[PDB]
Design a protein around this ligand. Sequence first.
Ligand SMILES: CC(=O)N[C@H]1[C@@H](OP(=O)(O)OP(=O)(O)OC[C@H]2O[C@@H](n3ccc(=O)[nH]c3=O)[C@H](O)[C@@H]2O)O[C@H](C(=O)O)[C@@H](O)[C@@H]1NC(C)=O
Ligand SMILES: CC(=O)N[C@H]1[C@@H](OP(=O)(O)OP(=O)(O)OC[C@H]2O[C@@H](n3ccc(=O)[nH]c3=O)[C@H](O)[C@@H]2O)O[C@H](C(=O)O)[C@@H](O)[C@@H]1NC(C)=O
Ligand SMILES: O=c1ccn([C@@H]2O[C@H](COP(=O)(O)OP(=O)(O)O)[C@@H](O)[C@H]2O)c(=O)[nH]1
Ligand SMILES: O=c1ccn([C@@H]2O[C@H](COP(=O)(O)OP(=O)(O)O)[C@@H](O)[C@H]2O)c(=O)[nH]1
Ligand SMILES: [Cl-]
Ligand SMILES: [Cl-]
Lengths: 360, 362
Amino acid sequence: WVKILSVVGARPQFIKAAAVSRVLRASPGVREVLVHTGQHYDDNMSQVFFEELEIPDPDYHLGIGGGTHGQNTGRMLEAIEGVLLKEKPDWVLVYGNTDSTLAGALAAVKLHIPVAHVEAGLRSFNRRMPEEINRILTDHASDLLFAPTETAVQNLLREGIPENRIHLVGDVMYDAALHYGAKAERKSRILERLGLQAKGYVLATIHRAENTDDQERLRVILEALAEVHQEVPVVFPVHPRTRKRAEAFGLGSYLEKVVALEPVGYLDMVMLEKNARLIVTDSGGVQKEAYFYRVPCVTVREETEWVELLKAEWNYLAAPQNAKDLALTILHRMRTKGVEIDLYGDGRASQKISDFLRKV
Amino acid sequence: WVKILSVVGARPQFIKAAAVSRVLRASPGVREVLVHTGQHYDDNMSQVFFEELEIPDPDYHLGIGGGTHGQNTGRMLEAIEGVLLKEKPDWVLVYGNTDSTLAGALAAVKLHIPVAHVEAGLRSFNRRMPEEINRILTDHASDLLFAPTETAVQNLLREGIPENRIHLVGDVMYDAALHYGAKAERKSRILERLGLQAKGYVLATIHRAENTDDQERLRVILEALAEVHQEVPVVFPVHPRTRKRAEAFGLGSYLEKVVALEPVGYLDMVMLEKNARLIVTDSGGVQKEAYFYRVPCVTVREETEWVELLKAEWNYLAAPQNAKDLALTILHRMRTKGVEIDLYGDGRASQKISDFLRKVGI
Ligand SMILES: CC(=O)N[C@H]1[C@@H](OP(=O)(O)OP(=O)(O)OC[C@H]2O[C@@H](n3ccc(=O)[nH]c3=O)[C@H](O)[C@@H]2O)O[C@H](C(=O)O)[C@@H](O)[C@@H]1NC(C)=O
Ligand SMILES: CC(=O)N[C@H]1[C@@H](OP(=O)(O)OP(=O)(O)OC[C@H]2O[C@@H](n3ccc(=O)[nH]c3=O)[C@H](O)[C@@H]2O)O[C@H](C(=O)O)[C@@H](O)[C@@H]1NC(C)=O
Ligand SMILES: O=c1ccn([C@@H]2O[C@H](COP(=O)(O)OP(=O)(O)O)[C@@H](O)[C@H]2O)c(=O)[nH]1
Ligand SMILES: O=c1ccn([C@@H]2O[C@H](COP(=O)(O)OP(=O)(O)O)[C@@H](O)[C@H]2O)c(=O)[nH]1
Ligand SMILES: [Cl-]
Ligand SMILES: [Cl-]
């Protein structure tokens, strides 16, 4: 009998936890307790994931969100701690690299509760980025480090974390893609609703702060996607923050010139990804999922944490400096492909993690 | 020309800030803002240091303290972020490794305000210490790391922190002792008051969480100090957390078997340490201060961050497993001395720190 408490706050964490939760569910002598921080609150950012991915209702919802880093992190720290004091779990699992991840880890370590980091050791090497600080500080606070890639393992060794706390387990988001693929196939009618032809569009997601808080980068991206749309329709589920920023800077009309949507559930997303001729993104999860489906990817950033996608020629960096340059880069890359190579494991990252926990 | 905001919360942070702040005040093109989180709030833990060490009143008092890690750290994080969004300093300086330290770093780093950590790179290699977590994460959140020892430099390099963000500046607590030592001698009447002569007593402080939060560990310490007291008077300024734990556990009567005091100010502390025959402590700063005055030290812990003191034989660990043994250890070490060696620098760590903050560049 072991109690594993999972802290999730954001869409990509709901998706990670859906894989790990499934395995821990049907594991003998494990009870999972699941805490939703409230970081993501809109139904299209949160509830649709619990429904479509069949995720047990959370035991706690702390309803903390939409504030500053200080506010969100600070309140999450106090609220999560209160839950840990009640539930006394054997393990705390945190996912990814948001404020929720860091608050979960830090709440737990101060109470002498072991913390395991799902998706450990990724580095952008740009420490001005909030997400890099979150990765570094979470990794250094954790007891177990579940690395998805060899690079991630090397990044942890280089920062003095001992071998014996690092397990290369592959990527749980690959597990999720595998497990939910069929259900996406039989439930998603988004190509229908959108009048899209399989391989008759490009898929785009953009929400990095460094791309949406900076008017000139955001303008380069929306200008570039509208141009690309002239040639091949662009489907663009727009993150709420991205949509806020584009409206605020007067760039809303570019969204009207493509097939812009509110955020979609995972099942639609899978169908849009699979059927896309090419994916343009600044999302970590979406650039891996592109590779899952052997759809060429352009990452609108100066670096990625997922370097093996660049090496395997499946993914290509295009920093948003020039709208025409970026447009042409997207259009050129859609008739490219990468090498045959299996990354991210066998799709049983979640049971490797289950096993390592119930042992250690 | 440059605005440097310090975050302090606890007694040892006020002493460190005293030393640095004096320098920063002399420096042209340097404005300071001091934020007192409120972590330490009693006058004999906060106010007395401001007054005797000549520190100006804090620009802000957040009045947070007395809660869990969660509550204190969380509220400090939100509160400090508010101040920083008002003051928009060029640097935030954090000291040591309390919950205040970490909340200060975390507030700052997410606003892209550069953080400098005074007393950087120390490691106990014991994560059960909240303090170990605080200094690991502070260090990894910092853009400048002011290391007091070579061990601390090596600890940082081993955790992947680049050499160019690390500077071995020595210890500002040696600067403090050096700068305030004449005033202590001039003003302190503590020895007169207690009725002690030089070398006629042992000084004790105890306040680690791992020593006070466990009933029988604390009993081991208090009982050992009672025993020592029979052979050589024991003077014991008692931390409020320690008194409170001793009360709740029903161990109050042990404090009658020694010369238990309320916390003393820095000036009285210097005179107590300076004139002690031996110091027994679980304090970080007190360990070093014992060496400053060439007084043998016994550290009542399973480890210290200040390992050079053990190697120079000025300090000796004695984990509290057994009262008779801890007593005997204490009395045995009273007759010892370490090797002559200079540690902690030249008493101008603050000046080196000021210099780096000013010339680091945009
Ligand atoms: C750059 C960065 O730090 N990123 C971190 C960030 O993730 P991320 O950038 O992927 O955010 P995000 O794109 O919202 O979600 C993608 C998912 O949403 C689905 N997705 C996407 C759009 C949509 O409309 N519908 C939908 O279902 C997709 O199908 C896909 O499954 O938070 C993660 C977390 O903390 O767990 C970290 O692991 C990441 N760290 C890394 C290193 O990738
Ligand atoms: C073990 C540990 O983590 N310790 C950390 C801790 O310090 P510390 O353990 O030394 O606490 P503490 O003993 O209350 O203060 C001593 C001072 O009080 C004076 N002092 C002491 C008693 C007294 O009655 N009067 C008085 O003036 C003494 O003269 C002396 O100058 O908080 C510090 C901080 O974050 O800045 C960190 O730098 C430390 N990290 C290290 C590594 O030493
Ligand atoms: O359900 C949600 C989640 C987020 N957001 C918006 O997206 C912003 C960024 O939120 P997030 O939690 O992603 O912050 P990050 O992890 O990027 O720091 C928020 O302030 C909101 O404006 C929203 O509108 N609805
Ligand atoms: O001025 C003060 C500061 C602290 N405390 C008590 O000491 C406890 C521990 O305080 P803190 O969490 O700052 O840690 P510590 O001072 O022991 O390192 C507090 O909860 C209070 O009960 C007190 O009585 N007066
Ligand atoms: Cl998005
Ligand atoms: Cl004390």
